[PDB]
Design a protein around this nucleic acid. Sequence first.
RNA 1: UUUUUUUUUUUUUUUUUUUUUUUUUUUUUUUUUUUUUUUUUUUU
Lengths: 227, 228, 227, 228
Amino acid sequence: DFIYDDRPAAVSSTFNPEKGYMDFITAYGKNINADNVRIFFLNHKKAKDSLKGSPKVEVDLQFGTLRVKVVNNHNPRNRDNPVADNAITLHRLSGYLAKWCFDEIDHGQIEEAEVKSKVVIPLAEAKGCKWGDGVALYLAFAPGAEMFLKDFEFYPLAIDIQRVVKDGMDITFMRKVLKQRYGTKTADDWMISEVTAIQSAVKVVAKLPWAKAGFTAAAKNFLAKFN
Amino acid sequence: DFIYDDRPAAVSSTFNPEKGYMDFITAYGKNINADNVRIFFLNHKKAKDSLKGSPKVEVDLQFGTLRVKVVNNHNPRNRDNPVADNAITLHRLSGYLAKWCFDEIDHGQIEEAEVKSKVVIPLAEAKGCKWGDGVALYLAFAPGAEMFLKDFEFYPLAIDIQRVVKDGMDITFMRKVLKQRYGTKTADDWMISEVTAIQSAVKVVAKLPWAKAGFTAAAKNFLAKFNI
Amino acid sequence: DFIYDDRPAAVSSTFNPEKGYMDFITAYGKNINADNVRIFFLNHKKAKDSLKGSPKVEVDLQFGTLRVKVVNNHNPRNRDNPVADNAITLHRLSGYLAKWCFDEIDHGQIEEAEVKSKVVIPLAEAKGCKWGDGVALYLAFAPGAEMFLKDFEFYPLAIDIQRVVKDGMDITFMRKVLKQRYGTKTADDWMISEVTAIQSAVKVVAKLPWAKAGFTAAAKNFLAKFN
Amino acid sequence: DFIYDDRPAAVSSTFNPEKGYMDFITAYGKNINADNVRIFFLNHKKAKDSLKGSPKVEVDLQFGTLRVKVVNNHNPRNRDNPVADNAITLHRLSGYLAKWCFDEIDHGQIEEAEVKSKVVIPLAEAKGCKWGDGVALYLAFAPGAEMFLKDFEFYPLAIDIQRVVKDGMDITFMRKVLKQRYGTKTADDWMISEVTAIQSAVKVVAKLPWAKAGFTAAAKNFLAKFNI
RNA sequence: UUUUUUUUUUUUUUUUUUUUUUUUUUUUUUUUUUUUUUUUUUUU
């Protein structure tokens, strides 16, 4: 009576990031602008702890002009609460807005210019990557980019790999990306089929500063006078 | 100001898992089914933390329709409370239900299918073991299985060994398992007598994927292409 | 106003464990017996955490029939409060009672029998040391024994060293023992003078079960590996 | 429905440690004496935990005769609050009092005697540094000293580098310092210009015991005879 | 030259570690999903 537990059932996954993205756009597309994409991408972690502190399972948030209805599972008890396929987590939202940046870029040159001039990703910065390095590569640092592997040319995967080898990141964080699809190909398929594109991606990512989150170029060229 | 201290004394162990199990069945057997057992095996860890939080000495819990009166020794101070041989801790509860699944499978075909299709052991999966691998083996991953070394065909021991050698497990954990009995044969006895069976078990456990639970080969084989 | 702070100044210690022990015997010696001592050594950690919980500076404790007026500096805020040389902390109490057992054994064989048949020190045990191995050695595992390095034949020091090499003990715990005296010799002296006797002690402790904390090898295992 | 969020957009470097110091002295210079500076430096960490506990956005503190209006930003939730340049953080306060000591010593023989005989900086001692080793050097161990790289002859920098090299300190703690000025020289400037002075400082700091304090040789030596 | 996270004198000082025994107890390891969660977060 003091503590009661109850059963979750097994299932397979009916969640298509493409569809979730489209429904998300149809639902919120009027309040999305490069300004909000930018405050969010600067407010991801802040929102991470902000959700972490609060105990409500279904919180709505405001980034500037953007209103978002998000599921909160950062809070401990909620880590196993269910999440609808039309629902949005900060991870899913992040991926979605990254996707938005990617399409918006292709829409034309004025479109190409605005976001590029106004979009920087802290996670990408901390490793010293900027837009000039590549579009797919640069946007791939956004969490949730793993949902759109093709558009980002296997770069989120490669980045995760580099995190494992150089930053000794715990291997479990590759769990999510290793379930994800490459177009029509299931994980099991592309894990053997597409090794080439992946290795190429790894190379591409390798040729990057990878500064320590991050030291302006004066560092770490000065700290290699003392070692 | 006062704090309050006195002597605990030494004795031998009068706890028979076979019988303890029998009283557990006699007492709770009407609400034990594959459903509730499955709910237990999925909520072991959660309930463990929930017991860690509370300082109550004797907590009651409900897994689906099954209610059990459990002794709490996960709360730090409570780690030294006495435990009756007719009392139940989660470890004992797990072992008991592991044994229950083990018997129920032999009860017949419907029961075998019910248990096999429902019951899930997180620890076994996390190492890539499934029901198809074996009943004794798959169930041996359940905590408390060490209390029934015979029925689980010495497998929990083999698993523990496999854990120390590749996962660098702290050896201290083998303390419980290394005193456990083989049916009636004593630890000191079976520890040289049945060496063959043990070795066979170790070999069986040896051939398994044994990746981290989240992914298993060829997820494992794909990392290999870059990093083990 | 909100919190304020103030000075402490210090250079020296006037604290002689011999004198402290003698005063302790004079004050409490009628209530000291193998029963109470034994209860103490089994409830040391318990009382220690119980003191960690309480914020009171000077707590009363009862071990069997023995009541003690002990100083509490286990509470974080209290960790830098002063300690009189005639005062008693759980560490001082433990060391004192270790000394007491050591003397009581010499009083005759019957007293030796009460202490040996009753008193048990968990830390000595966890390493597989028993009374049969030696009195000085067995008692040396008791916290506070470092105050009487002479009587315990350098064994607490050797034990601390072995904790560092085999158990990866953080070296900081040896700070205390390395300031202690060996009878009349100060630290600076015996650290060079008694190196031989110390090494002998180390060899003794070394040839002990240890191997490892948490285990008794009733039967050996054709392990792939040990430890 | 609402967890209010909004944007800060920026990158400006107002804060001038010289000016901050001058305002701080103008405000408090009369209540600063060797006594209070000493008690402060002895109560730095305590004040740090005590403020971590508190919810005040701006806490008030008393060190001996000195009362100060300090900004509290060690508190998790408070960790993103703004900080005025005429305001004082406990880091800033520490650096400021270090500078104070540096000026006061030069005031004369008697003042030098008060400061040298009273003020002790635990971090400097913990590495075996004493007043006799140097004034700038000894004072450089004080947190916030990185604000006055000129006065302390690049010693806070050298000490930090040395923390990374000898104590494997996470390199991120070298952030600040690597933003600070050397008198007029910008970091981008002095990082190339004053390399000579830098390494000299580095060597000076290298020529120190730098053992846990903690221990003194013989002891390091006594340990060496078994372990490091 | 934001802010914070670590590092804190000197004592025969004080704290932080290690804590017998048992078919005892506790400490470790916890499924599957295009699920969710834990790490990595610009610029002074």
